[PDB]
């Protein structure tokens, strides 16, 4: 992967405001800000890479900024952070992973519980929410994920 | 990360987020953003002057940025834009004007319906809501107002 990052960063705050103000929410999130564990992935770049991760996300997973950026979030699904696309995970529910995948392909809001692993190998249940986000052009370009341990 | 600062070094999006995530809301505002008529006033400057006004506010009141910045928002209480402090308004409920006043001194959220006039003198009912806001120090430094016709 050779993910590129938007020079000048991302309008995280503008996207959080966009999400809280969306007209027909399929999932209720309640108020949110940059304090939770969250990430933004680029839907238009190869294998939907992470182009931003809040500090709470790094704190929750144990990985640093350098270790997460430019990677598809699926690496958390393995205690060794090694998960090849299309692979049959041995520690994660296949239907769960397929649900996330179809929701993303369709720009449809989804919410699931997925088994994840921290950098030190510690297993936990991630209560994950993904919401598609429109950029300045008005079309879906990114996806915002909200991660919660338990 | 891209923090868009609005023309003074003001983090308007940051405060909108702060306001929507406040722990003890005394008034439901529902989601809000910069596409609505809002303004920011500096509580630590003489007579709580407007330091920021969105384009929607300027459109709704007919006044321009040069005509509103640095002024107390009470000028809308008169069809000529002239209102001296402490004065007994002749077109605005005295009780309402006092409610806003005390709420602001106490940094307490408030929502009211006040009579206002656009720059051209057109009278309209403003459904105003004011919420105190904390700056980087964690203490109330500004107040954001949400105006609705
Ligand atoms: C903003 C954002 C944040 C994210 N945050 C996280 C996070 O914190 N943690 C996390 O674990 N993931 C996270 N993800 C998810 C991750 O990036 C992948 O999207 C997810 O693993 C699903 O896509 P995939 O590419 O891995 O699918 P694939 O690798 O293709 O895997 C799909 C699996 O489903 C099975 N499958 C496929 N079709 C069917 C079918 N018809 N019936 C039954 N089984 C089927 C397959 O056998 C396969 O093993 C996030 C995604 C986004 C966009
Ligand atoms: C962010 C923000 C946004 C705002 N947006 C608007 C807006 O869109 N429109 C608008 O009109 N205002 C707006 N305001 C309010 C305005 O700027 C003033 O705060 C408001 O008019 C009250 O303060 P004052 O200084 O005018 O009070 P004063 O000049 O002191 O007037 C209060 C009035 O109440 C009467 N009064 C006082 N005490 C009593 C009493 N005990 N019993 C009976 N009567 C009494 C007085 O006789 C007087 O006429 C906004 C304020 C903020 C902070």
UniProtKB/TrEMBL annotation, chain B:
Q: Identify the coding gene.
A: vvd
Where the record annotates domain PAS, the positions are: 50-107
Write down what this protein is called. Answer: Vivid PAS protein VVD
Recorded GO MF terms: DNA binding; nucleotide binding; photoreceptor activity; zinc ion binding
Cysteine sulfenic acid (-SOH) is found on: 36
On the tree of life, the source organism's domain of life is: Eukaryota
Please report the organism this UniProt entry assigns to the protein: Neurospora crassa
Q: Does the keyword Flavoprotein apply?
A: yes
Q: Which UniProt keywords apply?
A: Activator, Chromophore, DNA-binding, FAD, Flavoprotein, FMN, Metal-binding, Nucleotide-binding, Photoreceptor protein, Receptor, Repeat, Sensory transduction, Transcription, Transcription regulation, Zinc, Zinc-finger
Full-length numbering of the shown residues: 37 to 184 of 186
Q: Which residues bind FAD?
A: 72-74, 77, 86-87, 89, 98, 101, 116, 126, 147
Q: Which residues are recorded as binding FMN?
A: 72, 74, 77, 89, 101, 116, 126, 147
Q: Single GO cellular component annotation?
A: nucleus
